[PDB]
Amino acid sequence: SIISRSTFEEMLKHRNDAACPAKGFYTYDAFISAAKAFPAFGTTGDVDTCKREIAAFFGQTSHATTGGWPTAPDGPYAWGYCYKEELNQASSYCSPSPAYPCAPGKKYYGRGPIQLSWNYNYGQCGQALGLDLLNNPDLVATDRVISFKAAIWFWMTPQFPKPSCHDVITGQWSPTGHDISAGRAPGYGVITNIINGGLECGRGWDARVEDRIGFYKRYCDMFAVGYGSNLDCYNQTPFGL
Numbered sequence: 001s002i003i004s005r006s007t008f009e010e011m012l013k014h015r016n017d018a019a020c021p022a023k024g025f026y027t028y029d030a031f032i033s034a035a036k037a038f039p040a041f042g043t044t045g046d047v048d049t050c051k052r053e054i055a056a057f058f059g060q061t062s063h064a065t066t067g068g069w070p071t072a073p074d075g076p077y078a079w080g081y082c083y084k085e086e087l088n089q090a091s092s093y094c095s096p097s098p099a100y101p102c103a104p105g106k107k108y109y110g111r112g113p114i115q116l117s118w119n120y121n122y123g124q125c126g127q128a129l130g131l132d133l134l135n136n137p138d139l140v141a142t143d144r145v146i147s148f149k150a151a152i153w154f155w156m157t158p159q160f161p162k163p164s165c166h167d168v169i170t171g172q173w174s175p176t177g178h179d180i181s182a183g184r185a186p187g188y189g190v191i192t193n194i195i196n197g198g199l200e201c202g203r204g205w206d207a208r209v210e211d212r213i214g215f216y217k218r219y220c221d222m223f224a225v226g227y228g229s230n231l232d233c234y235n236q237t238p239f240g241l
């Protein structure tokens with residue numbers, strides 16, 4: 001009960017349009033089942049903080065899967081969850097390691113709501129959930145429940161030097177001096193940085209960053225809560241340089 005059926009359907013009300021390749025795949029019942037694997041997701045903090053965690057998770061995943069455009073019906077921030085796999089599937093996304101070795105003939109391109117990528121992410125996730133995602137990465141795009149479990153797993157897991165998205169949005173992250181001079185003050189912008197900052201943050205205005213913010217504001221307005229501070233990353237140095 002971290003979110004109701006009718007709220008879920010209104011948030012994602014164009015995902016089953018004829019133009020959307022993932023039509024029929026994303027369901028309320030499968031999201032609720034995946035959430036049970038991570039009981040602290042959506043239940044941490046006061047009432048306003050729980051609402052902001054739900055709006056931020058669906059804001060970032062909506063951008064990663066959007067089919068919107070500026071004159072779309074009900075505006076561009078009603079078109080999340082239209083896709084479920086990366087458009088260009090040429091690359092294998094292999095970064096060789098003894099810990100998580102790349103399986104022969106397999107490819108670790110983006111799948112599901114968070115567009116999970118690279119062998120080390122499929123590997124760590126599969127270990128945590130007791131699933132064989134390193135040998136069978138397609139499961140993140142073919143099984144309705146596992147697709148959501150992989151996205152929530154990423155949201156909840158720190159990867160040094162990055163904190164978890166969960167910790168940042170619930171107020172459990174405390175920035176160091178190094179973070180402060182890089183412009184990384186706590187808020188929605190730092191979450192964009194964790195997810196894809198190497199390509200999107202610190203260079204000035206960027207259309208992808210604006211689109212992430214638009215979805216988050218719409219969902220916050222639906223729940224009647226304020227946005228918080230520091231929403232963009234136009235002036236933040238990326239993690240890991």
Ligand SMILES: [Cl-]
Nearest residue numbers: 038039040041
């Ligand atoms: Cl948890």
